[PDB]
Amino acid sequence: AHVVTDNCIKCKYTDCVEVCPVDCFYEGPNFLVIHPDECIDCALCEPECPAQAIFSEDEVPEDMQEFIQLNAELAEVWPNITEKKDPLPDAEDWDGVKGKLQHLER
Ligand code: SF4
Ligand code: F3S
């Protein structure tokens, strides 16, 4: 499965959902996650994310391993999102800021 990591938080561009063939993205207030059981690892979403926050599981950075389990957990409680929407206000300001997990909203 593919995994959404740290840089998505407070950016949430949502450009990734338009190319997902199986609609396996789930939406949080300021973050998106990928459902590991529905994802077919087509990898089409990776180049579409301006935040470059999506990685295949085996490529998730060492300092963001927590996101693998987190995607699986939140994908079970958040609503499905299949349509592109406007990025969060000030997404540009937060794109590139590290350790945004501290700002994750349930
Ligand atoms: S790898 Fe493919 S199936 Fe998985 S979330 Fe990305 S676009 Fe969807
Ligand atoms: S910022 Fe997040 S909402 Fe999608 S386009 Fe990137 S994983």
Curated annotation (Swiss-Prot):
Q: How is the cofactor bound?
A: Binds 1 [4Fe-4S] cluster.
The UniProt record gives the binding positions of [3Fe-4S] cluster as: 8, 16, 49
Q: Show where the 4Fe-4S ferredoxin-type domain sits.
A: 1-29, 30-59
Q: Which residues bind [4Fe-4S] cluster?
A: 20, 39, 42, 45
Any single GO molecular-function term of the entry would be: metal ion binding
Residue segments, region Disordered = 83-106
Its name, as the record gives it, is: Ferredoxin-1
